[PDB]
UniProtKB/Swiss-Prot annotation, chain A:
One of its GO terms (molecular function) is rRNA binding. One of two assembly initiator proteins, it binds directly to the 5'-end of the 23S rRNA, where it nucleates assembly of the 50S subunit. Belongs to the universal ribosomal protein uL24 family. It holds the Pfam family KOW. Gene3D superfamilies: 2.30.30.30. Part of the 50S ribosomal subunit. It comes from Thermococcus kodakarensis (strain ATCC BAA-918 / JCM 12380 / KOD1). Keywords: Ribonucleoprotein, Ribosomal protein, RNA-binding, rRNA-binding. This is Large ribosomal subunit protein uL24. Coiled coil: none annotated. Transmembrane segments: none annotated. The gene is rpl24. One of its GO terms (biological process) is cytoplasmic translation.
Curated annotation (Swiss-Prot), chain B:
GO terms for cellular component: cytosolic large ribosomal subunit. Part of the 50S ribosomal subunit. Belongs to the eukaryotic ribosomal protein eL39 family. The lineage of its organism: Archaea, Methanobacteriati, Methanobacteriota, Thermococci, Thermococcales. GO terms for molecular function: structural constituent of ribosome. Keywords: Ribonucleoprotein, Ribosomal protein. One of its GO terms (biological process) is translation. PROSITE patterns: RIBOSOMAL_L39E. Coiled coil: none annotated. It holds the Pfam family Ribosomal_L39. HAMAP family: Ribosomal_eL39. It comes from the Archaea. This is Large ribosomal subunit protein eL39.
From Swiss-Prot, chain C:
GO terms for molecular function: rRNA binding; structural constituent of ribosome. GO terms for cellular component: cytosolic large ribosomal subunit. The chain holds residues 1 to 74 of 148 of the full protein. The keyword rRNA-binding applies. It comes from the Archaea. It comes from Thermococcus kodakarensis (strain ATCC BAA-918 / JCM 12380 / KOD1). Part of the 50S ribosomal subunit. Keywords: Ribonucleoprotein, Ribosomal protein, RNA-binding, rRNA-binding. The gene is rpl15. This is Large ribosomal subunit protein uL15. Residues 1-28 have a biased composition (Basic residues).
From Swiss-Prot, chain D:
Keywords: Ribonucleoprotein, Ribosomal protein. GO terms for cellular component: ribonucleoprotein complex; ribosome. One of its GO terms (biological process) is translation. The keyword Zinc does not apply. The gene is rpl29. This is Large ribosomal subunit protein uL29. It comes from Thermococcus kodakarensis (strain ATCC BAA-918 / JCM 12380 / KOD1). NCBIfam families: L29. Belongs to the universal ribosomal protein uL29 family.
Length: 120, 50, 74, 60, 102
RNA sequence: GCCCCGGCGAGGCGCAGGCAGCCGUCGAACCGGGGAUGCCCGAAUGGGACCUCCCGCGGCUUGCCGCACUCCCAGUCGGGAGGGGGAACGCGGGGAAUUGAAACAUCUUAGUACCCGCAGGAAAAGAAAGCAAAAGCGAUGCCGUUAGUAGGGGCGACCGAAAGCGGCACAGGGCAAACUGAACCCCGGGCCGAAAGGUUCGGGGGAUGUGGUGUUGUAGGGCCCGCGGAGGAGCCCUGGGGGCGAAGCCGAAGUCCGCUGGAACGCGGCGCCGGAGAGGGUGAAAGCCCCGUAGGCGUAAGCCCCCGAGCUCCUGCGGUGUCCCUGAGUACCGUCGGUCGGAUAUCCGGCGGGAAGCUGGGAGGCAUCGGCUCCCAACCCUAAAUACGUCCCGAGACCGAUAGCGAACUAGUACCGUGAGGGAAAGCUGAAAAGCACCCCGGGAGGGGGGUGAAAAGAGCCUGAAACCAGGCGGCGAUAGGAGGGUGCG
């Protein structure tokens, strides 16, 4: 995108009302050194079957799989990152993807490989 | 018997349908924000424009 | 250079802002008419001022020639 | 219903199909007043798809 | 920028660059809503005769300004009305000042 | 919400945090381009409207097209134009009073408010019957000065220019007539072509003149003699290269080790990038976590440039002449009304008179006479420099929810008035709903024990002032006199 505006209200307006096809890139996560080396890429946008390691927060050191990506709210769900309700059922804690690191990719799709080849 | 014109009848029918309270699932979906709207009209209090 | 402050600042709390009784700072009656009213020729409230400080404001004297004919030499 | 499957067929099959779908929509709207609460929406949209494709076949 | 880093370490103004980095603050008041977060502090000024690369190279250091002699005004030399700014002159700028006499 | 072509690359189903479900990898949502459907009223138009609904004609085969008024071309067939809407800016007409003059009548307010008509993305103006004055300039429009000057004015209050000078931007063309006399234009069909546009039949115009010529100062043109015969600048795009021009692409470097904490973006220590230390987001103050940023990238249609491609309508120079022509209720005078700084010397209109017309005509601040200087009206077109912003973009010694637009929100909304018209209030849980499982009482709203959370911050939700109210604590409190205070001693 072309965000050259020193004005905070304009930045925040863009982010709150961004079209859907540009929110995947606002939801990008970094890669492990290993994949960084073997592919030549520093970050990629997040996807459901990816395996992630939590880097900041209460759930530190937890590895797990992505099971939900929500673009309206800018949050993801990760299996294993859960808290209990008063009654006792388990619900997911939502995370921002800039707090997680990708330690294993899910590549059963050609266009994501295209992304990689474009930016490596 | 009381002799209405058809177009006036249709406008009165719309005014009749308009007049109900907010649905409950809307309050739930919205997390108790939308709970009343500006067009509750009662036939003794506020008269319409025929 | 010398940047002194305005005196409305010092007159906060004065109640009349230097103008005297609370009845004296009103409209055109408080000036005796608007502008050069009353300087003579019909009314005379400022005729004393006219005869001290501004004679030859009322009346006419002389004639001017056109610029097409005026020559100013160096 | 998909437009590729609708483009293999003749205008008369398209017409028969619209008749059938309209009858279903009426029946469903009657029972609705009495399991997939989206039947009405998908039937509506299918009728629309058929009419579009019939018009574009005629204009040719 | 790294070359300029080394040069400035050798000439002895890196400490003022570091002061300017350290003394930058988030300001008080409603300026934060209008931009104007981050009052930024002033460091050294490089006066040059021509730009051939050095604006590129010195821009990004906190508090550093680069100017030609021909376009030199008083705010570059006395920020906040206060004189006495650390300034790196070139020999060609010195000669061109000789010419301009001012 | 239906279809297609491209892009993006996995989720999506408006504001809007629900129950059930569906669409999508056969490339969706979203973005760019293009199509389809598109009820009634409304200029509203087949004819009528006391209720945005009714009632008909035809002709073709229920399904279909056509049928308003005013006008042009026509012609008993048809082909065309107009009507309504638009914030501010634009052109042309009609035109007050409050007010000031310390009253008021000329004046001022004011060619203002408001009314009527007419256009566009800009409009209007515009190529000297001019400005000047012993020198000269050279179409129009805009900016700065000229200047509160010349001048107007109960010569009062007040009103009020231009030329010139310095700049921005530049550009000039065509009719009428004299001479010629059908050599001409338009519509349809048959052909050729990418096309510029040719050529044929059938019609409409035109001798009350279609086309050719020609467009200016003592001049220009025509005719008349003659020597010369570079209109060739434009237009069409089978071809062609370049460039502008997208949605869109790429874009550096720590989540390193201890303490605090619910959570590091903190403190202390150790490193790195920088043409990038603008701004924002992320569970606290982040150049190195993410978007971006500096800076490199590419691009279909659409558009500009030029090489080529095919094709067009009249043509110069020098001068002679008792030969012809060059705009009429017009120029000009008198009078009345309006208007202007325009004063005996501004412009507009009405009424009564009224020319010359190339051996001619006009202007030069009262009239007229004579000189000198400058020009040729009464017919037409014309870019750029300028004004505006109902829209979009960027920025800010602007406000920060009684502020700022009336409106931070389901606002010109609710609501009031027969109607013209008038017109509010109303922002904030938490990092995460984790939005209180379970037991006793109560008809119930609820109370009490227990739980979630760093914290109840419990939706009657950030902080949570004062006035006011209830209870608890302390001092006084039923023989007593001053605006509720001051000094001194208990």
């Amino acid at each position: 995108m072309k965000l050259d505006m020193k004005q905070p209200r304009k930045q925040r307006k863009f982010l709150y009302n961004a079209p859907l096809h540009l929110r995947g890139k606002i939801m990008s996560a970094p890669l492990s050194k290993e994949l960084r080396e073997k592919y030549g890429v520093r970050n990629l946008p997040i996807r459901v079957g990816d395996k992630v390691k939590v880097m900041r927060g209460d759930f530190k050191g937890v590895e797990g799989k992505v099971v939900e990506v929500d673009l309206r709210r800018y949050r993801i769900h990760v299996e294993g990152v859960t808290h209990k309700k008063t009654d006792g059922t388990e619900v997911f804690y939502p995370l921002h993807p800039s707090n997680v690191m990708i330690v294993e990719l899910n590549l059963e799709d050609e266009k994501r490989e295209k992304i990689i080849e474009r930016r490596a | 018997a009381r002799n209405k014109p058809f177009a006036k009848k249709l406008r009165l029918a719309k005014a009749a349908k308009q007049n109900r309270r907010v649905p409950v699932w809307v309050i739930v979906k919205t997390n108790r924000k939308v709970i009343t709207h500006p067009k509750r009209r009662h036939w003794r209090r506020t008269k319409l424009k025929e | 250079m010398i940047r002194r402050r305005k005196k409305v600042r010092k007159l906060r709390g004065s109640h009349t802002h230097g103008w005297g009784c609370k009845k004296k700072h009103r409209g055109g009656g408080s000036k005796g008419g608007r502008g050069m009213a009353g300087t003579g020729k019909r009314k005379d409230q400022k005729w004393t001022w006219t005869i001290k400080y501004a004679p030859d404001r009322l009346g006419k004297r002389g004639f001017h020639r056109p610029k097409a004919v005026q020559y100013i030499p160096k | 219903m998909k437009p590729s499957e609708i483009r293999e067929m003749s205008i008369e099959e398209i017409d028969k199909k619209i008749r059938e779908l309209r009858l279903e929509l009426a029946k469903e709207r009657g029972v609705l007043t009495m399991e997939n609460p989206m039947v009405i929406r998908n039937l509506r949209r299918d009728i629309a798809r058929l009419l579009t494709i019939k018009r574009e076949k005629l204009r040719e | 920028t790294a070359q300029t880093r080394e040069i400035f370490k050798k000439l002895g103004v890196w400490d003022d660059i570091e002061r300017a980095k350290k003394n930058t603050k988030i300001r008080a008041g409603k300026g934060k809503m209008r931009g104007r977060r981050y009052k930024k502090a002033k460091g050294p000024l490089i006066v040059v005769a021509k730009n051939e690369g050095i604006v590129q190279g010195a821009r990004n250091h906190p508090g550093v300004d680069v100017v030609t002699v021909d376009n030199l005004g008083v705010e570059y030399l006395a920020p906040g009305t206060h004189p006495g700014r650390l300034t790196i002159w070139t020999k060609g700028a010195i000669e061109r000042l000789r010419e301009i006499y001012g």
